Symmetry: C3
Subunit: 258 residues, 3 copies
């Protein structure tokens, strides 16, 4: 039917191609550039929105998707996805200001770059994921962190925590030793007595022989037992002496004359 270049500055090349708005360019049979400053390249390629660019056969930018850019066979920026950018065959942008990066890629949120993709004939999953490589370590808060950075950051903190736990355990050992020692000092100061050359108990301070207070008590109690017996035995003797003395006095008096 065409080619028909009806817009100002417009160019249309190929059978059926049409460029119908100002500054539109359509190149490829049946391509259509129906937006202002729109560009369509390839067969059946449609750049319908203002400022849209569709590159590759059957690439598509919806007429509502102002500033949409689609590159690759069947790459698409869909309804309401203003400023969408689809990069790769069969990539699809369905969100504003987002990027579907890679063949078969999709978008899921606005203001997003998405590198996951519609899986084909072999996955139970709806979307597959892509590994992202070739990164320098991020420096800014909004830079991507690498696996290397993650490991080093986590490893460093892990070693620092190991180290702190060590210091604290040593502190607790030292503490218990000093606190336990305090009580041991008291025990030692109060529970021993020195023993003399002749067995006399003395202050433990700088003494040759040393014994425990309980042993000293047992031994001293034994001495007391002996003394206790003797005192009772002597008492009996003294009583009998007294009685005999008074009996002698009486007899002396009787001799004298009573």
């Amino acid at each position: 039917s065409d080619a028909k270049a009806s817009g100002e500055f417009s160019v249309a090349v190929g059978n059926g191609a049409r460029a119908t708005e100002k500054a539109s360019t359509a190149v490829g049979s049946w391509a259509a550039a129906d937006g202002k400053q729109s560009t369509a390249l390839g067969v059946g390629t449609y750049a319908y929105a203002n400022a849209s660019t569709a590159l590759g056969s059957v690439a598509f930018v919806d007429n509502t998707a102002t500033y949409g850019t689609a590159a690759g066979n069947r790459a698409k920026v869909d309804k309401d996805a203003t400023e969408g950018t689809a990069l790769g065959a069969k990539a699809t942008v369905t969100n504003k200001n987002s990027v579907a990066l890679g063949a078969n890629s999709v978008t899921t949120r606005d203001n997003e770059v998405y590198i996951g993709y519609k899986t084909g004939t072999e996955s139970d999953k709806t979307y597959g994921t892509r590994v992202l490589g070739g990164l320098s370590d991020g420096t800014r808060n909004s830079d991507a962190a690498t696996v290397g950075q993650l490991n080093r950051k986590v490893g460093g903190v892990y070693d620092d925590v190991k180290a702190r736990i060590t210091v604290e355990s040593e502190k607790q050992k030292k503490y218990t030793d000093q606190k336990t020692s305090e009580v041991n000092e008291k025990v030692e100061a109060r529970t021993t007595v020195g023993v003399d050359s002749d067995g006399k108990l003395t202050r433990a301070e700088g003494a040759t022989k040393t014994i425990a207070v309980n042993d000293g008590l047992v031994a001293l109690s034994g001495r007391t037992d002996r003394i206790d017996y003797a005192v009772g035995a002597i008492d009996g003797r003294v009583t009998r002496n007294t009685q005999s003395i008074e009996k002698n006095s009486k007899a002396i008096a009787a001799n004298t004359r009573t």
Copy 2:
């Protein structure tokens, strides 16, 4: 005025289009491909640098930006941005070997991929950011780390640290018990005495009754008090007996005759 294809192998299509260097291609009214192996597609699209490619109306590659690639309406690779790549409408590359990815995107450093973007009519911020989705977990040090990886790596270390702190606290409990027990063993060994059937103090080892050394001392001191009194009382009696005996002897002698 044109179209003018003056370079070797050059092609120019559209009113005013020009392709002026070897292997240049300009397609679109007023497009210009002025670099060697340069390609311009769309109205007013300029590929000025050697090996530059500008795709979409008003896309632009500065003549100094050798190897610059710009795709999307108004996408631009600017002065000195050699090997720049602008992907999306109004994307701008101002750094060497960098990529402005997405509509409105910019670059800030050389050797950078940048997915942040010039914000429009509604932000006090100069640049907005984009969330990046669809990643497989990175495996290499220069791979991107995912949120999933970050959480699992940090969570695992966190649990490991919990576990270590537990082991160490239990070690400190066990330690204090054993150290505190040592002193308790000493206290117990030195501060008790066994008590006999008849009250005799003995070694605490395997004794029926047991008392504390201080109680034993108090009780033994009381016995000593009693003995102390008795010894003094007996002494007085013995003194008086002696005096009476000597008096009797004198009287006996007087009876005898002195």
Copy 3:
């Protein structure tokens, strides 16, 4: 020789250009679009595979690389790299369903986006890396984590671990104090005696003066020494008294008459 548009819906523009399959479009001298729905733009640009798109002079998609998309001077999707996407001058995709993003970029794995690149005249390294900026914090497990997130996540756990170590050290202090105190209570209960107004030993409970059991034992042993001497001395006296009494009795009897 050409231009030759021999495919259905095909368009070829430029000397030697050829579009030889259904829905193929070749624009640029010596360009070739030899795939179904293939599109080649620029001088010597080859879109050989079905559904391939090659944009920029010398851009190339291998005939086996179905759905390959290459944008930029010399950008290439190579043998067997089906669904490859090369974005930037001299970018090369050698893996299925992968993206070489940026000038000089490469791919290393299938299902990968790669932003590292072949270094040129000044590196001993084969591949350079690119910093990735402009990210919003990831929310999903497959979102990219930012440096900001990594730091905050790691910092928060680090503070939490600090805090836990503090609590546990305080627990160990409190524990040792209470356990050490228990033994101190026992020591104090068993190792002191009260001293009376008149020196009498009593239970330490609510006493004016207090002394240690070992000191009390030493002092009590000294009293016992004194008593021990006295008992022996008194015994000698009592023996002598007895002997004198019996001698007096004998003399009294002799006086009486024996």
